[PDB]
Design a protein around this ligand. Structure first.
Ligand SMILES: CC(C)=CCC/C(C)=C/CC/C(C)=C/CC/C(C)=C/COP(=O)(O)OP(=O)(O)O
Ligand SMILES: CC(C)=CCC/C(C)=C/CC/C(C)=C/CCC(C)=CCOP(=O)(O)OP(=O)(O)O
Ligand code: NA
Lengths: 344, 358
């Protein structure tokens, strides 16, 4: 039913913009543009984060029409957040396709300049929507703080993912250099699971798991002083890692060319001979067909099988963390979520 | 000067927050190094008209005693509006492909930064505002109203930007064809003559400038002081007038001002709907209209000269001078109809000091 309510939240926000002191013709142009911005970018994903909110809310509470209206609001707000992350991420990473269609920023009628502005519109629409539907709820402030704090962590994780190999992170920033572009290179001191977990937990775990779970519980009426919140934070960290490692696995089976610190990169570096370390450093992070293939060949050489081995062990560690919650409703949801992560 | 001395307190309060994240120590020192510069490079160097408006309004709203922790909350909101400006300027320079801002390279041009970091940094700077308001105004009754004011003014600015970016675009000229989500090719941008009018210009400029630059600071000062009241609507209207006044001057500077004085080099080549363009178009001959259509929006210097010579031919400088006097009087007349002495003093002082600062 979550998908049925999309139009309401979209139209609610667009109705706010329509109240502006603007000429009727100009209002028409913007409702056209912004309806598409939402539709193109909020619709078409697996909706795991949105569904997670709704499932957690239902399995803590055990629900009328207004209650679901607030739950579905927060669910779509996180999908709107994902949309904003998606648009921004594709600008930054100069992406080609997202969800089997052209990245928003690539479109002739959009371009990078609009996509930047649109990320901030999508991002700010979130808080207008929460205001519209949850202004008079007692959890109102805690909910917006949860979005804010999870977003800040995501920004920092995104920063680390972008810059972990950059010449600035190897051992001051030059405010006079606008002319000499730094060549993308690997930094071997950063190729380790400790650094990787830092990035992954901040970039993924907080907005993807912590935020949706907390929204559900917050709206349900679980007081923020409750000890479960810290347990859920710890579980969310484990799941975020699990999800991103799998995301890294799917990419190879544009991270190689984009010089990304991936789990496949770290595992390979851990497993490979010294000559192959030189081979990785020479061939990684380059937009060259021959270079990517060499990196592709090494992943095949050092066996795909190591991911499967990790996936089984991490899943077990999560189910153990889930079981110490001592909350049946959330436990089932988290066990169900864990099963349906990759499919949606 | 008091406002300026408080800068580090608020910067370091946010930097400490990031420093609390569960990260390895080496990572944490890289983060703090990057983000200290992000703030320093982009928050310092302006006229600080928006920050000072907060400070002045907070004080002159009512003649009263104000303790140092009370001033700490005001200087926070004052600096939050300067962070917002810093986020706006970084974003604007990305979108417009800027060269200089406040007499130095645009943040995004730095080879250590690039567009990819700058986009991420806009969102960090923007989000730091709300973390700061939380840290310092968490337990204030006006807290929800303050962040909602930031939120709503930002939304309007985003809409103003959208229009400034897209007013002459294909989508606006061809309102009948839907956006082709399969077209990843744009053809040379041109002006749309139906859009060259002052009614459209005010729509754009009020939203892009007036709400964040005037309404937001004044409302911040008032809400925190403890004032809902009918004066807010009257203050919304003056803000409209001052924003329009401010942006027209800003259009004047673009073509007629020294880049070593203003700190920045664009409107003609960026195909912008400007006051000098609208003023030229209602005043010039038909052959000159075609000349404008032919030459406006082009990066070639021979094309911008043609436009620049037309501004000289039609003496746009004197037309602005005439506007400036007319509008300044129009604003003072609305300010005098507020029936509030303290805010009147501030708005009068601000109107005198807009273009120089302090
Ligand atoms: C929501 C965010 C952060 C944004 C994305 C994109 C948006 C809406 C944009 C920013 C566009 C904007 C309003 C502009 C820039 C205006 C600017 C930097 C200029 C001039 O103001 P002055 O007051 O003259 O400059 P100082 O602050 O240096 O005195
Ligand atoms: C604060 C904002 C909006 C922006 C600035 C830039 C930031 C922090 C970025 C975004 C980085 C990010 C979290 C990434 C992209 C991850 C992504 C879009 C996801 C994949 O998630 P799935 O759930 O597999 O995709 P679906 O939603 O299509 O199912
Ligand atoms: Na999702």
């Amino acid at each position: 039913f979550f998908r049925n309510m999309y139009d309401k939240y979209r139209d609610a926000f667009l109705s706010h913009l329509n109240e502006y002191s603007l000429e009727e013709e100009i209002k028409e142009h913007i409702s056209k543009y912004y309806k598409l911005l939402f539709d193109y970018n909020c619709l078409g994903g697996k909706n795991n984060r949105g569904i997670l909110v709704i499932l957690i809310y239902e399995y803590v509470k055990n629900i009328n029409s207004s209650e679901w209206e607030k739950a579905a609001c927060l669910a779509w707000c996180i999908e709107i957040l994902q949309a904003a992350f998606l648009v921004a991420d594709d600008i930054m990473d100069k992406g080609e396709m997202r969800r089997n269609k052209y990245c928003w920023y690539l479109l002739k009628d959009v371009e990078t300049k609009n996509a930047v502005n649109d990320v901030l519109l999508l991002y700010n629409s979130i808080y207008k929507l929460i205001e519209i539907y949850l202004r008079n709820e007692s959890c109102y402030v805690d909910v917006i703080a949860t979005f804010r704090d999870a977003t800040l962590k995501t920004i920092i994780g995104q920063h680390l993912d972008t810059n972990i190999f950059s010449d600035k992170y190897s051992d001051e920033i030059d405010v006079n250099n606008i002319n000499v572009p730094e060549q993308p290179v690997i930094d071997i001191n950063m190729i380790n699971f400790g650094v990787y977990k830092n990035i992954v937990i901040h970039k993924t775990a907080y907005y993807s798991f912590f935020l949706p779970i907390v929204c559900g519980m917050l709206l349900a009426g679980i007081a923020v002083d409750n000890l479960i919140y810290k347990k859920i934070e710890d579980i969310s960290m484990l799941m975020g890692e699990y999800f991103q490692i799998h995301d890294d696995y799917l990419d190879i089976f544009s991270d190689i060319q984009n010089n990304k610190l991936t789990w496949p990169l770290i595992k390979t570096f851990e497993l490979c001979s010294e000559p192959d370390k030189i081979k990785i450093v020479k061939n990684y992070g380059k937009n060259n067909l021959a270079c990517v293939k060499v990196i592709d060949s090494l992943y095949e050489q050092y066996k795909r099988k190591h991911y499967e081995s990790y996936e089984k062990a991490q899943k077990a560690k999560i189910l153990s963390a889930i079981n110490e919650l001592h909350h049946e409703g959330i436990e089932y949801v988290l066990k169900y979520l864990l099963e349906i992560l990759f499919t949606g």
